[PDB]
Amino acid sequence: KTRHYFIAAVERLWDYGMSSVPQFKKVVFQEFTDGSFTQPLYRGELNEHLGLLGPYIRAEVEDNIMVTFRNQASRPYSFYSSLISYEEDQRQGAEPRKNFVKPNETKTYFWKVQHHMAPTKDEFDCKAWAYFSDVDLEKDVHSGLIGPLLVCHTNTLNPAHGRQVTVQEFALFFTIFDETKSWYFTENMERNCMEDPTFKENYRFHAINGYIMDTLPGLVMAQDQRIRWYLLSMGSNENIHSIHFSGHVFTVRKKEEYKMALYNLYPGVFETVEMLPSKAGIWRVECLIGEHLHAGMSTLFLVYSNKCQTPLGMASGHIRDFQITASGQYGQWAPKLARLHYSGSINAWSTKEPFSWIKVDLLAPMIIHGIKTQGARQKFSSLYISQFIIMYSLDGKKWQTYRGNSTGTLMVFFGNVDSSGIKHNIFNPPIIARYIRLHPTHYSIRSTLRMELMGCDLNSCSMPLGMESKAISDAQITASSYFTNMFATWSPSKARLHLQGRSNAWRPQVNNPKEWLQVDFQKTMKVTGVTTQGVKSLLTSMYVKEFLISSSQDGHQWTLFFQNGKVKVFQGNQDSFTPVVNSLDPPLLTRYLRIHPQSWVHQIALRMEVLGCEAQDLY
Amino acid sequence: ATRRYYLGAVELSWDYMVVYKKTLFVEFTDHLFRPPWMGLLGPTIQAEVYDTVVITLKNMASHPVSLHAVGVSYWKASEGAEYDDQTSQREKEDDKVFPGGSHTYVWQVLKENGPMASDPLCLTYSYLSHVDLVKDLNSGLIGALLVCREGSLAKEKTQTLHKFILLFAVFDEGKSWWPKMHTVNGYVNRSLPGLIGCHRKSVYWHVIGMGTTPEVHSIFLEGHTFLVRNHRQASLEISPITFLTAQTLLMDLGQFLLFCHISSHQHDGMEAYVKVDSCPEEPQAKKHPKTWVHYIAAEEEDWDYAPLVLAPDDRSYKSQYLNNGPQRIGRKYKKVRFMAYTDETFKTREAIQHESGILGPLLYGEVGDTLLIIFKNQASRPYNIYPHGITDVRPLYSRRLPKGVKHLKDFPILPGEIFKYKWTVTVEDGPTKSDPRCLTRYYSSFVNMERDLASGLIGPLLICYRNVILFSVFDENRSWYLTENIQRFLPNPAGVQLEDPEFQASNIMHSINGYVFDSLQLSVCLHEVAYWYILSIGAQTDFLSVFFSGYTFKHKMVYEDTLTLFPFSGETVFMSMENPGLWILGCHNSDFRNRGMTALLKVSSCDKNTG
Ligand SMILES: *[C@@H]1O[C@H](CO)[C@@H](O[C@@H]2O[C@H](CO)[C@@H](O[C@@H]3O[C@H](CO[C@H]4O[C@H](CO[C@H]5O[C@H](CO)[C@@H](O)[C@H](O)[C@@H]5O)[C@@H](O)[C@H](O)[C@@H]4O)[C@@H](O)[C@H](O[C@@H]4O[C@H](CO)[C@@H](O)[C@H](O)[C@@H]4O[C@H]4O[C@H](CO)[C@@H](O)[C@H](O)[C@@H]4O)[C@@H]3O)[C@H](O)[C@H]2NC(C)=O)[C@H](O)[C@H]1NC(C)=O
Ligand SMILES: *[C@@H]1O[C@H](CO)[C@@H](O[C@@H]2O[C@H](CO)[C@@H](O[C@@H]3O[C@H](CO[C@H]4O[C@H](CO)[C@@H](O)[C@H](O)[C@@H]4O)[C@@H](O)[C@H](O)[C@@H]3O)[C@H](O)[C@H]2NC(C)=O)[C@H](O)[C@H]1NC(C)=O
Ligand SMILES: *[C@@H]1O[C@H](CO)[C@@H](O[C@@H]2O[C@H](CO)[C@@H](O)[C@H](O)[C@H]2NC(C)=O)[C@H](O)[C@H]1NC(C)=O
Ligand SMILES: [Ca+2]
Ligand SMILES: [Ca+2]
Ligand SMILES: [Ca+2]
Ligand SMILES: [Cu+2]
Ligand SMILES: [Cu+2]
């Protein structure tokens, strides 16, 4: 039984932006091994969401919270919560006797997490009390700190490993930030250039976990996975904040099971709720007070689908060569070489012994559930990468060492141990960056790799529908005209990517600059894009090089794609062998689809897949 | 189609039958060229779970007005939101509609969107427009949307029509387009019709709060108790934007009034009348109560919120309040309290506890118990004695009224006299199955409703199936005995600042139960479980009350709430509190200067005395 946490008050700088930059010195809470400073003060990945918030001090029913506390700012503070409880006393006093801690001073609070500090039979596997610094109930708190404590019943939160995990936890805390009433000259005086009306509203943030306007970060969601929310609210009388989870509803328990779609935080109240986001994507969660919204207090939870996963094409076409980058590789084993690419001498990236980084520009920010690593042989001597960490970013400005689950400073991943390794490493929780770097830690006499990261797109789309997967009927597929001869019958039905057999492709009876291949999706659908192809049949090779796309929601009316004003020419596949893919930047969405070849090499012929995601039937 | 609706957005003018023009929600069969009680509301749309709706809003407006849903499922089509959701065109299309643009919405009543079954049938949500909320909603961009248990509407033909949609709204008319508004469904001064209900049959309120600023309300119904959470509410506390499904029993007949009760709110509106008529008929020992007796009186005396350390002058935060200075009258003022008086007519029962300050006698009510307030106005100005909480209050011996006047609380105010009163308790007045027992109540002197109270007359009434903490604010300035106070403590005899900021709020003490910064200390021995009946009165703005001791303390209203309780002011609810805590306790006024100005108090951890 029992849990200790090593927690402390830091003075640090707060910014937002992304729109003169306002720089503020508030004081927050962080947790580290017990090495006072240089090491180790680290937390990250999933926990972004707390932001200003101190870390999750989670305990169980029964067991103890021990909480060491170190102040590191000019004016003494104190870790206090409701449950800073048993202090039996002996002619020594109780309440003011451990009241506060001077800078650098160091105190441990330790109590028994009684039943009266707990969730009831009336449900929710965890509660959500709060820790503040008393001494100044308002002053320091506004300026600096707030912490979310949560106790859960018995066999509830995971042994050794973290806390909970059955379900995802989030402590969004809603408040108005007045500043000025918080911290003084070092805060107040900075950016000097005058008491209430002039810019007073300017100091006031209306901020979730201290992120005004849409700044809040960590909302890895995950379709169909119970999510507990922690809504502890605070401040002065203005903040009755009526939080709303855009087109989601949740339940709460309190002697019964009530459903509701917005609940109001009376400063001090906190609370807990559970919901499961049935539909994935981006969405808002905001206080719905009109004034309070346009002053900030809105953020987006960015829920993904699990069944989304696909290669981003480091193997295939979609990824172009310019996309990659390296420490600079000794040997000509230049990057531009990754995954399955065995050609002649050269099939991978490969630097010398000094520490390296293969970074990847995805050309867009994107979610990524995992990477598949590779190594190659040369001259008998086995080349691979044994162990590595992933770094990622969005703008190339920020960078981040990825932790995911892994207890401590980060997760190191286990690479292959041979040439032709194929190690699917997995990123749940998953990365969001546009930029994935890769630093190796161990190798075998050299560093070297082929790789093909797999993720899905920021929205939970970009996936194949029928066609290849055969899930779309060759009753469903039609086309303008087809090449049918005794035996060979280049039916529209055969326009399915990577299909090998008799008559394995589509062909129009004889060629025309304007033909068409069509797919009766049946359901009204969205389309991310289209993977296109070509076929060789008996030593004669043939493929479609240029093409045009129709679509209709209308059985008999069609509307040509139009791009940047003009209708657009689609460039893909210089060959039969390979398939290559087109983005479809503004995604046309229809029930029925059509495709018209322009430049067709030798002879017209097509196999393909479509890309996409389901949207509502009957509309 | 499962069900479908057509909305408009028409710009119409409004008189609140002052004239104002507004762009509000409208409905038709399919384009073209209601029921009055609804008035302003964009039509109340409602769906059973599983069955799913579609609007096709036509923006027959100047404004580009969007359609957000607040409590169903969408696809980025249904919600009217533009925000960096990386969905692009056709999917932001209805995520904010253009002027003159007639565009279409889709939404679903998902099995999970539905009520819990511990919940009431039909959970009240609404809709609006998520395109500049303040520039929107004002001018009429709010309707009511309700989702209900599946075999739902089929019943309505069988079921009660007693489904009224109460829209409590602070339209800052002077947005989207001079001073504010306070309406109830879009009427101001007791305006508006409908609001009829059956006699012995109960009525249900589909309640919608409406803000666009931190604006708060507390809304009663003339002698009527509310049912919401299945705990009697008696108050319908209503936050900036809330959704509440409440019900009202509707005993008796005629015209009673719901209304926002606060300060300046009534001078702005928010009150409206609810008729009950009789209705068309259509058939297809060891136990029991005893009655309470109280010889009680309103006597007058000076009140000193003391004494602890007096910290003079430079303590320009502390002392300014309770120090006799050139223009100040600290600590002691002349008041009137209720006493149960010891030596007089109909003998007595009188001994005082320091622990409740001004607080009157505590009067205890068990359902079906009766009360016998043999009241006399012992001192000065004529004062009244009425209990907020109970209902059957008529002088004993007669249902007649002093011939002269309406509802005793109103007038017969007894200046040197004695009046005999009967407070019969019904179960109606009492706590439900769900609410904890001994719900907190108070009684005042309704010589008007407020003016005297401030003076110092107040006490605690428990209704039940006894530590009391009243927070209160004593204005002193509106107190009857101000002339008698100014001319008793201040240095210059009479002539002095008539009124001023400097002294005004310097003679408004923040009470702690009419006790000041530190007082009471209180006498609770460790491990003793208490019941803590607490209440705010005096001045208003929400309340934030907490216990902060050698165990901080936690308490249970059902599920245990922590360094928090929130009496709405002119309002009250009560608390169980296991005491395995410890000594010296910040006891919370908790909020703003409220904290700096008057909060404190303490708690103990003694033990070893038994009986
Ligand atoms: C890093 O941290 C993250 C979280 O921060 C963790 O990743 C998470 O891992 C857990 C556990 O490994 C994952 O949960 C798993 O989910 C699968 C399948 O999902 C379930 O839910 C789906 C939706 O249905 C919902 O509604 C159902 C009621 O209608 C309800 O039952 C269900 O729970 C859902 O709420 C649906 O596909 C299924 O219903 C499915 O159940 C599940 O199969 C996993 O296993 C269960 O384990 C319990 C406890 O032993 C058993 O009682 C069940 O019967 C399941 O048995 C499974 O394991 C046994 C072997 O023990 C095996 O024989 C059997 O075949 C099952 O496989 C499990 O619950 C969660 O989704 C991950 N979350 C995230 C965000 O990644 C990890 O700790 C860590 N992970 C990594 C990869 O590094
Ligand atoms: C709804 O009912 C309200 C009252 O129940 C009505 O309010 C009152 O009526 C009008 C509109 O406000 C006012 O008419 C004039 O107002 C002045 C000044 O008002 C007060 O505030 C100023 C501010 O400095 C103060 O100086 C004054 O002393 C007042 O206290 C009055 O002095 C005039 O007599 C005059 O009546 C009333 O003032 C206002 N009430 C009060 C208390 O003044 C409202 O009109 C109704 N609205 C509708 C739509 O029906
Ligand atoms: C606690 O905090 C202060 C910082 O204000 C401490 O000063 C530092 O002490 C550590 C010793 O480990 C050194 O690393 C630094 O050189 C010191 N910083 C300075 C002098 O600026 C100090 O130890 C404590 N403060 C007091 C007042 O005793
Ligand atoms: Ca839309
Ligand atoms: Ca949108
Ligand atoms: Ca009065
Ligand atoms: Cu708000
Ligand atoms: Cu009001």
mmCIF file of all heavy atoms in Angstrom, chain A residues 195-206:
data_model
loop_
_atom_site.group_PDB
_atom_site.id
_atom_site.type_symbol
_atom_site.label_atom_id
_atom_site.label_comp_id
_atom_site.label_asym_id
_atom_site.label_seq_id
_atom_site.Cartn_x
_atom_site.Cartn_y
_atom_site.Cartn_z
ATOM 1 N N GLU A 195 -4.559 51.403 -14.899
ATOM 2 C CA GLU A 195 -4.935 50.700 -13.673
ATOM 3 C C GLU A 195 -6.114 49.734 -13.870
ATOM 4 O O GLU A 195 -6.089 48.618 -13.336
ATOM 5 C CB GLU A 195 -5.239 51.698 -12.547
ATOM 6 C CG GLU A 195 -4.915 51.188 -11.147
ATOM 7 C CD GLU A 195 -3.465 51.423 -10.724
ATOM 8 O OE1 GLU A 195 -2.757 52.260 -11.343
ATOM 9 O OE2 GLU A 195 -3.037 50.783 -9.739
ATOM 10 N N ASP A 196 -7.133 50.167 -14.618
ATOM 11 C CA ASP A 196 -8.300 49.332 -14.933
ATOM 12 C C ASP A 196 -8.783 49.417 -16.405
ATOM 13 O O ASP A 196 -8.673 48.441 -17.144
ATOM 14 C CB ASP A 196 -9.465 49.629 -13.971
ATOM 15 C CG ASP A 196 -9.172 49.240 -12.522
ATOM 16 O OD1 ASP A 196 -8.090 48.696 -12.207
ATOM 17 O OD2 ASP A 196 -10.061 49.478 -11.677
ATOM 18 N N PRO A 197 -9.330 50.608 -16.839
ATOM 19 C CA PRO A 197 -10.029 50.541 -18.140
ATOM 20 C C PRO A 197 -9.187 50.264 -19.391
ATOM 21 O O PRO A 197 -9.649 49.547 -20.287
ATOM 22 C CB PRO A 197 -10.682 51.922 -18.262
ATOM 23 C CG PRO A 197 -9.777 52.829 -17.510
ATOM 24 C CD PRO A 197 -9.393 52.020 -16.306
ATOM 25 N N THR A 198 -7.987 50.833 -19.442
ATOM 26 C CA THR A 198 -7.233 50.974 -20.684
ATOM 27 C C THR A 198 -6.887 49.659 -21.396
ATOM 28 O O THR A 198 -7.098 49.544 -22.604
ATOM 29 C CB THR A 198 -5.981 51.871 -20.491
ATOM 30 O OG1 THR A 198 -5.276 52.006 -21.733
ATOM 31 C CG2 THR A 198 -5.046 51.312 -19.416
ATOM 32 N N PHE A 199 -6.389 48.675 -20.648
ATOM 33 C CA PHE A 199 -5.920 47.407 -21.224
ATOM 34 C C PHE A 199 -6.170 46.253 -20.257
ATOM 35 O O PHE A 199 -5.683 45.133 -20.452
ATOM 36 C CB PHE A 199 -4.421 47.490 -21.555
ATOM 37 C CG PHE A 199 -4.115 48.170 -22.865
ATOM 38 C CD1 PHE A 199 -4.122 49.562 -22.962
ATOM 39 C CD2 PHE A 199 -3.787 47.424 -23.997
ATOM 40 C CE1 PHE A 199 -3.840 50.198 -24.163
ATOM 41 C CE2 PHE A 199 -3.496 48.055 -25.203
ATOM 42 C CZ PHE A 199 -3.523 49.443 -25.285
ATOM 43 N N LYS A 200 -6.956 46.536 -19.220
ATOM 44 C CA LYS A 200 -7.219 45.586 -18.144
ATOM 45 C C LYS A 200 -7.817 44.301 -18.694
ATOM 46 O O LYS A 200 -7.434 43.205 -18.282
ATOM 47 C CB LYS A 200 -8.152 46.202 -17.101
ATOM 48 C CG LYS A 200 -8.258 45.461 -15.776
ATOM 49 C CD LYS A 200 -6.888 45.086 -15.221
ATOM 50 C CE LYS A 200 -7.048 44.239 -13.962
ATOM 51 N NZ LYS A 200 -5.901 43.309 -13.790
ATOM 52 N N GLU A 201 -8.736 44.450 -19.644
ATOM 53 C CA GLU A 201 -9.296 43.311 -20.362
ATOM 54 C C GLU A 201 -8.181 42.521 -21.038
ATOM 55 O O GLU A 201 -8.269 41.301 -21.167
ATOM 56 C CB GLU A 201 -10.316 43.767 -21.407
ATOM 57 C CG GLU A 201 -11.765 43.655 -20.952
ATOM 58 C CD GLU A 201 -12.619 42.853 -21.921
ATOM 59 O OE1 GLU A 201 -12.394 41.630 -22.051
ATOM 60 O OE2 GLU A 201 -13.519 43.443 -22.555
ATOM 61 N N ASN A 202 -7.136 43.220 -21.474
ATOM 62 C CA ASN A 202 -6.018 42.578 -22.151
ATOM 63 C C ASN A 202 -5.263 41.608 -21.273
ATOM 64 O O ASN A 202 -4.889 40.535 -21.745
ATOM 65 C CB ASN A 202 -5.060 43.608 -22.729
ATOM 66 C CG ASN A 202 -5.661 44.362 -23.886
ATOM 67 O OD1 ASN A 202 -6.768 44.886 -23.789
ATOM 68 N ND2 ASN A 202 -4.940 44.406 -25.002
ATOM 69 N N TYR A 203 -5.042 41.958 -20.006
ATOM 70 C CA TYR A 203 -4.423 41.004 -19.091
ATOM 71 C C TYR A 203 -5.310 39.792 -18.783
ATOM 72 O O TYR A 203 -4.795 38.697 -18.551
ATOM 73 C CB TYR A 203 -3.979 41.666 -17.793
ATOM 74 C CG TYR A 203 -2.868 42.681 -17.926
ATOM 75 C CD1 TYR A 203 -2.838 43.801 -17.095
ATOM 76 C CD2 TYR A 203 -1.831 42.518 -18.848
ATOM 77 C CE1 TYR A 203 -1.825 44.747 -17.185
ATOM 78 C CE2 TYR A 203 -0.813 43.458 -18.950
ATOM 79 C CZ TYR A 203 -0.816 44.574 -18.109
ATOM 80 O OH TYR A 203 0.179 45.524 -18.176
ATOM 81 N N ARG A 204 -6.632 39.989 -18.788
ATOM 82 C CA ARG A 204 -7.591 38.906 -18.507
ATOM 83 C C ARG A 204 -7.645 37.825 -19.618
ATOM 84 O O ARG A 204 -8.106 38.068 -20.743
ATOM 85 C CB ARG A 204 -9.003 39.448 -18.145
ATOM 86 C CG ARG A 204 -9.099 40.385 -16.922
ATOM 87 C CD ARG A 204 -10.527 40.742 -16.453
ATOM 88 N NE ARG A 204 -11.495 40.796 -17.555
ATOM 89 C CZ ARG A 204 -12.516 39.950 -17.719
ATOM 90 N NH1 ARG A 204 -12.752 39.005 -16.822
ATOM 91 N NH2 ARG A 204 -13.328 40.065 -18.771
ATOM 92 N N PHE A 205 -7.138 36.640 -19.302
ATOM 93 C CA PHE A 205 -7.342 35.511 -20.181
ATOM 94 C C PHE A 205 -8.558 34.807 -19.670
ATOM 95 O O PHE A 205 -8.771 34.724 -18.468
ATOM 96 C CB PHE A 205 -6.176 34.499 -20.202
ATOM 97 C CG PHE A 205 -4.792 35.099 -20.130
ATOM 98 C CD1 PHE A 205 -3.785 34.409 -19.439
ATOM 99 C CD2 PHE A 205 -4.472 36.298 -20.794
ATOM 100 C CE1 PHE A 205 -2.513 34.917 -19.362
ATOM 101 C CE2 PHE A 205 -3.196 36.812 -20.714
ATOM 102 C CZ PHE A 205 -2.221 36.118 -19.995
ATOM 103 N N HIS A 206 -9.360 34.317 -20.598
ATOM 104 C CA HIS A 206 -10.404 33.371 -20.280
ATOM 105 C C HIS A 206 -9.864 32.031 -20.785
ATOM 106 O O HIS A 206 -9.941 31.741 -21.973
ATOM 107 C CB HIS A 206 -11.702 33.788 -20.976
ATOM 108 C CG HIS A 206 -12.079 35.219 -20.742
ATOM 109 N ND1 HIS A 206 -13.355 35.607 -20.399
ATOM 110 C CD2 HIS A 206 -11.344 36.355 -20.785
ATOM 111 C CE1 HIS A 206 -13.393 36.920 -20.251
ATOM 112 N NE2 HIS A 206 -12.184 37.397 -20.479
#
